[PDB]
Amino acid sequence: HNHMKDGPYVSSEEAVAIYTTTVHWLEARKFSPIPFPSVSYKHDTKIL
Amino acid sequence: INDKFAQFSEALFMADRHAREEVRQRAMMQQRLAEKERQQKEEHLRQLA
Amino acid sequence: CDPRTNPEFWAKWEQFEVQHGNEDTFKEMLRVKRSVQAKYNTDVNFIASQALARSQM
Amino acid sequence: NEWLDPSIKKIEWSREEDEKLLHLAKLMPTQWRTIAPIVGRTANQCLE
Amino acid sequence: SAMARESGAPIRTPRAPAQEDHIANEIRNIKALTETQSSLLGGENAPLAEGA
Amino acid sequence: YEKIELTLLNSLLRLIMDHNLADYITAKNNVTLTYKDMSHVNSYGMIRG
């Protein structure tokens, strides 16, 4: 209830700085984003 | 609820869009160097040939 | 006002809308009519509606 | 809690509730159980 | 007029602008800022239309 | 765990993976916790379970 009333404690500039830090780190390591699990994707059954 | 939530969300959305734009520019900038480098190597090979 | 007990007022409102109104205000008046007609679906108001409906005949 | 509670509005939606619902769904993405008390319906009603 | 003698019909509501349809505006804004994939991929940002 | 903002978490999860997975995870962390006759919606912080 106090979070609903007193707003997001993470201020907007803090969230933006954290987001841009994550963006710069992830492009620096050339990270390929995880796709949705496709329809066929054989490994599915083993993962299941 | 507090108003700051809206401002919070707005910032993230703009930040997200900005990041994507920057990435795209850097990405396309990179490929320019890539093809330029390829051309240079090809030219060198032609000279060597 | 009740739509199924006071239809003349709704007729006058539609007349005012066709003299002065648009399709957006007309859709608003349909929405308010549907919401009010849904609101007055109580047992006592249904009883009153049927009582006046068979009283006028 | 989702159907039989007498505080649940089963009538068709208004335009004001549509404006509030879309505004809040833009504010808090996929936080539907948060949006539902503010909008005035349940979470599945707002989602659908 | 008395000293000379002695000697549109309807009114219109302005129409709501088509760009100011706030419901469809928020629809296309959420569709722009929700189905957008990871920002590391790059790609064109969806054109959000706000008008005023 | 207490101080995870679910909107920022949704944005960072959208960064690493597909937006459907991020939306599922953030909607999963916003549930109603019930113990006996007590019940409340968890809109702030993550669910460790």
Side-chain angles (χ1 to χ4, degrees):
Chain A
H1 188 82
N2 280 8
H3 179 252
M4 279 324 100
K5 294 313 231 163
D6 306 319
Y9 304 126
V10 186
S11 70
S12 306
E13 48 262 12
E14 292 199 346
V16 160
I18 289 175
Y19 185 84
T20 51
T21 309
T22 315
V23 161
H24 295 155
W25 171 262
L26 277 169
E27 66 182 1
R29 322 297 289 178
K30 285 149 192 195
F31 180 76
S32 289
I34 303 166
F36 195 78
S38 187
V39 194
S40 63
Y41 196 65
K42 176 71 149 56
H43 300 340
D44 266 3
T45 177
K46 308 202 205 89
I47 275 169
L48 175 61
Chain B
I1 59 173
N2 216 10
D3 52 356
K4 289 193 297 182
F5 285 91
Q7 306 179 12
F8 185 94
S9 299
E10 283 292 327
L12 276 189
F13 278 127
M14 311 335 297
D16 177 68
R17 284 171 82 92
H18 209 75
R20 195 174 292 104
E21 184 76 15
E22 271 193 328
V23 161
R24 163 151 45 80
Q25 301 310 311
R26 185 178 296 113
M28 61 79 71
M29 182 179 72
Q30 273 301 109
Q31 80 96 23
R32 303 301 181 51
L33 276 184
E35 55 93 23
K36 179 183 176 182
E37 196 194 356
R38 205 193 79 218
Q39 286 163 358
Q40 284 163 328
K41 273 184 184 172
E42 283 170 34
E43 283 182 335
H44 173 258
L45 292 186
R46 180 183 179 179
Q47 292 169 21
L48 207 43
Chain C
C1 278
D2 193 34
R4 68 196 188 279
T5 312
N6 298 322
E8 297 73 22
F9 153 74
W10 292 94
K12 288 186 288 292
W13 195 13
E14 270 186 353
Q15 174 213 299
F16 165 71
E17 275 281 346
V18 65
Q19 303 170 243
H20 304 85
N22 46 46
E23 64 271 61
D24 285 334
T25 51
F26 214 84
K27 180 67 174 66
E28 268 282 338
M29 172 295 307
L30 273 297
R31 213 267 296 169
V32 166
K33 167 179 272 290
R34 280 193 308 278
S35 86
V36 166
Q37 179 61 253
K39 165 188 178 204
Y40 282 88
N41 277 123
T42 74
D43 296 325
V44 65
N45 290 76
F46 169 78
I47 283 156
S49 69
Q50 300 322 286
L52 276 296
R54 267 83 189 162
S55 184
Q56 62 202 97
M57 294 182 286
Chain D
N1 283 316
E2 301 299 282
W3 192 248
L4 280 180
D5 183 29
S7 71
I8 297 169
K9 320 201 186 110
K10 298 171 186 116
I11 57 179
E12 66 182 1
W13 285 60
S14 75
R15 199 177 207 78
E16 293 179 353
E17 279 193 279
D18 290 7
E19 285 165 354
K20 260 181 69 179
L21 165 72
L22 274 297
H23 213 177
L24 293 203
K26 205 258 183 184
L27 258 62
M28 293 155 139
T30 53
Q31 279 173 71
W32 286 114
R33 300 259 165 176
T34 316
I35 295 159
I38 316 168
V39 161
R41 315 262 174 154
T42 80
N44 297 97
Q45 287 193 356
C46 291
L47 181 63
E48 74 158 6
Chain E
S1 195
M3 82 155 168
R5 288 178 170 195
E6 274 170 335
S7 184
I11 193 66
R12 284 330 319 150
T13 47
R15 306 283 96 89
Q19 299 298 110
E20 290 327 288
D21 191 27
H22 188 235
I23 285 303
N25 203 308
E26 300 302 19
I27 285 304
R28 70 179 45 86
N29 267 11
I30 297 170
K31 199 140 52 72
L33 310 169
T34 287
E35 297 177 354
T36 183
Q37 284 292 278
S38 174
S39 88
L40 303 169
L41 303 184
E44 327 299 327
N45 276 330
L48 80 168
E50 60 269 20
Chain F
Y1 320 99
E2 300 212 343
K3 296 208 192 138
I4 285 183
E5 180 78 27
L6 293 186
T7 309
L8 178 54
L9 179 69
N10 186 28
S11 299
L12 301 158
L13 260 55
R14 275 168 183 267
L15 261 173
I16 49 152
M17 66 208 185
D18 191 48
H19 81 269
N20 291 287
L21 312 187
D23 282 11
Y24 184 84
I25 290 191
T26 312
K28 202 83 182 63
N29 279 274
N30 189 359
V31 285
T32 286
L33 310 171
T34 72
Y35 158 84
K36 291 198 196 304
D37 58 356
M38 308 188 51
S39 57
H40 74 105
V41 173
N42 167 80
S43 45
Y44 189 34
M46 85 176 298
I47 299 303
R48 303 186 260 173

